[PDB]
């Protein structure tokens, strides 16, 4: 009616205000400012280690806080904790649901969580008096497949699911304490800040929302994509983040300013991006494409500074250690390779 | 070599036994028959308590030294494009239908048809980039209800370009041909058809025969004879 029409007109006016406010502060671009510094040389990374043991596709992994341990989740129904030094397997955890989509590692190294396509997130306790990895408590309340899960602290966890809602859970009570709504499309990924106070997410509606942990309300919405978003991660500084879509583009956003700084597009590749990660200093961008290969980019002039090809199937997960010693890649052929 | 202490020897033994357990458990799921159950929801999909039994819902049953696993995914309520690739090592994706209620045209919207929706679902599930080399079986419906409705009213003439009427054998044959002629591969994929009955064995022996045929064809393709 008339009220609906005037509300739509007001929404359009506010959208135009946001657009022109963003455009007013765009005075330069990152490339023409950082062109001064000399480009880095051709980087070459050899396969130091190759990890074997999975019998199906690998969907996610998480580098531990010790820069030497990690976990892996796969569709065969097994969760495996790895030791990157001697390639040893520390634990092999069976799963109740054979379908999994994500995994996480606690900052203190005691808790591991994995869940998806079962509407349930489970928390596993590693250091137990029973000597095994038994689930501490089972979290339920979602109506869609879980896509990502991250440990905010030893007792607080934030998750994303298939019902276009992200809920900040509480391990102690077992019930949600904050729910984030507003996504029209399905949410697929999220990342946490070093101070554990702000976190963003990406969804299938080509939108990125800046949420707040404490008061549980959104402040900023980021756009520019034209396809679904699968992976996202912050910057070590904490004032920027990079996104990965299915249209062969990776874009860099920032939190303090509402503009677009840095984007990637190459005509020789027409495949999407499945994982994105940063190194210690953030000089170079790692983006594991799904075209059977992985690519290493440079964050100065949008110039590829090397290639990393050791897989024969789809690349699904990436990760860089806390100290930036090594980078590990995953693929659906059930082979994890550590590169240094 | 000998640089490892007594700690690392036990660590290597632990890793070796974990590998042994994983390899042993990975061979048990290779011989388990994986079926995918799909339908519109009002297609007899609730009739599993007797037909096949003496997020995702899973049921298990055994028939003649075989392990069967069907996953009912009708209640997921999510974008099917984003999670369809999980079911790839599947064989014999069942599509239970109910077209005996087509002549009593129920659309749920008053501008659609049951047959149109069934064809749309069939095309969506049979014309994906994945799922190639995957066989399909069909369970049309219980034959009692169709007869009671076709004879009393000649509403079958509403079907697009159909000549006959008031014939039980011809209408069912035309429906079966229309469903079977929906594939676009025709060289690596086939459709198995069965008419359901009140007897439970008739709806299980057909599945057993279809899966045995699929396994034989797969082995022939593997060994190079085909």
């Amino acid at each position, epitope marked *: 009616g008339s009220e609906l029409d005037q509300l739509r007109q007001e929404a359009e006016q506010l959208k135009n205000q946001i657009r022109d406010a963003r455009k007013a502060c765009a005075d330069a671009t990152l490339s023409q400012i950082t062109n001064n510094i000399d480009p880095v040389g051709r980087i070459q990374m050899r396969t130091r280690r190759t990890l074997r043991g999975h019998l199906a596709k690998i969907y996610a992994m998480h580098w531990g806080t010790d820069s*030497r*341990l990690l976990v892996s989740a796969s569709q065969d129904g097994k969760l495996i904790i790895w*030791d990157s*030094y001697t390639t*040893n397997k*520390v*634990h092999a955890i069976p799963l109740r649901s054979s379908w999994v989509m994500t995994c996480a590692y606690a900052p203190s*190294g005691n808790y591991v969580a994995c869940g998806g396509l079962d509407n349930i997130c489970s928390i596993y306790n590693l*250091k137990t*008096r*029973e*000597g*095994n990895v038994r689930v501490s408590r089972e979290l339920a309340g979602h109506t869609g497949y879980l896509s990502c899960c991250r440990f905010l602290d030893d007792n607080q966890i934030v998750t994303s699911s298939g019902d276009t809602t992200c809920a900040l859970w509480d391990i102690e009570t077992g019930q949600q304490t904050t729910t984030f709504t507003g996504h029209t499309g399905d949410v697929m990924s999220l990342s946490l800040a070093p101070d554990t106070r702000l976190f963003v997410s990406g969804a299938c509606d080509a939108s990125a929302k800046l949420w707040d942990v404490r008061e549980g309300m959104c402040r900023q919405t980021f756009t520019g994509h034209e396809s679904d978003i699968n992976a996202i991660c912050f910057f070590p500084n904490g004032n920027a983040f990079a996104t990965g879509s299915d249209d062969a583009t990776c874009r860099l956003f920032d939190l303090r300013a509402d503009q677009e700084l840095m984007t990637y597009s190459h005509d020789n590749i027409i495949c999407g991006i499945t994982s994105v990660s940063f190194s210690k200093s953030g000089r170079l961008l790692l983006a594991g494409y799904d075209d059977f290969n992985c690519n290493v980019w440079d964050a100065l002039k949008a110039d590829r500074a090397g290639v990393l090809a050791g897989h024969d199937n789809r690349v699904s997960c990436l990760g860089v250690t806390d100290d930036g010693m090594a980078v590990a890649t995953g693929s659906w052929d059930s082979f994890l390779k550590i590169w240094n | 070599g000998c*640089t490892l*202490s*007594a*700690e*690392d*020897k*036990a*660590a290597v*033994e*632990r890793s070796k*036994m974990i590998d042994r357990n994983l390899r042993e458990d990975g061979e048990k799921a290779a011989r388990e028959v994986k079926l995918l159950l799909l339908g519109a929801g009002e297609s007899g999909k609730s009739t599993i308590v007797k037909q096949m039994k003496i997020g995702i819902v899973e049921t298990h049953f055994t028939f003649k030294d075989l392990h069967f696993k069907m996953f009912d995914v009708g209640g997921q309520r999510s974008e099917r494009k984003k999670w369809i690739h999980c079911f790839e090592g599947v064989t014999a994706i069942i599509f239970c239908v109910a077209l005996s209620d087509y002549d009593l045209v129920l659309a749920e919207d008053e501008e659609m048809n049951r047959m149109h929706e069934s064809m749309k679902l069939f095309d969506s599930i049979c014309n994906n980039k994945w799922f190639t080399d995957t066989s399909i079986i069909l369970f049309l419906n219980k034959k009692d209800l169709f007869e009671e409705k076709i004879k009393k009213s000649p509403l079958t003439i509403c079907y697009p370009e159909y000549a006959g009427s008031n014939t039980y054998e011809e209408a069912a044959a035309y429906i079966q041909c229309q469903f079977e002629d929906l594939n676009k591969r025709k060289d690596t994929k086939e459709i198995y058809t069965h008419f359901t009955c009140a007897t439970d064995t008739k709806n299980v022996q057909f599945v057993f025969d279809a899966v045995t045929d699929v396994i034989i064809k797969n082995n022939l393709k593997d060994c190079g004879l085909f």
Partner: single-chain antibody
Amino acid sequence: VQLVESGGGLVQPGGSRKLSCSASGFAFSSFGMHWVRQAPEKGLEWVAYISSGSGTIYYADTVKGRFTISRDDPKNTLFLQMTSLRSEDTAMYYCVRSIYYYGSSPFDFWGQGTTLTVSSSDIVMTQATSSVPVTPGESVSISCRSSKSLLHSNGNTYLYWFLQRPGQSPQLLIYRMSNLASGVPDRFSGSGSGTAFTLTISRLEAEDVGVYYCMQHLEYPLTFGAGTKLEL
């Protein structure tokens, strides 16, 4: 968890007897097994190590080829069969909830254990301290030294300490001289480097007194230190 062992008592040099162990509340089939020969009022030694699933078997030099050990995974029971004995086999055995993976400590959870009274790499054994009276409220320092540099390429130093109290089976207190065990008071501590190692207690009271032993973990048949009693 609770861990009951049997087989304690007096056994003649010529005869046969079997030890028993029961593991409840934790996976007995995924934890390395060990045996310790606690010699009373003196230094003691380590006995045997069998991994989960009987992958590897080890024996002490003094009892090599003389004892038999058999495991029962379904019953979570590890046995010990004997043929002939010597007077130097009096022991206090501990099935220890500890298996060698990164982040875990050998001899972590000793459980309870049982006794054995026999009727009548391997760093040498040395601990000069015998008994030192002390008043609560001041730090106490004792030293245990080695003969070889334990700083490998990885930097791991295999030095363990456990305290024994009268009438109670001793449990783990400090391992590695860098990581403190769990279920123990935080007052215990320690620091050392190179060859000589010194144990330091921050605060002293009635419950921080006992008999300490320093263990080295190099040749699975490893030698352990002497007992240093503390008097209130």
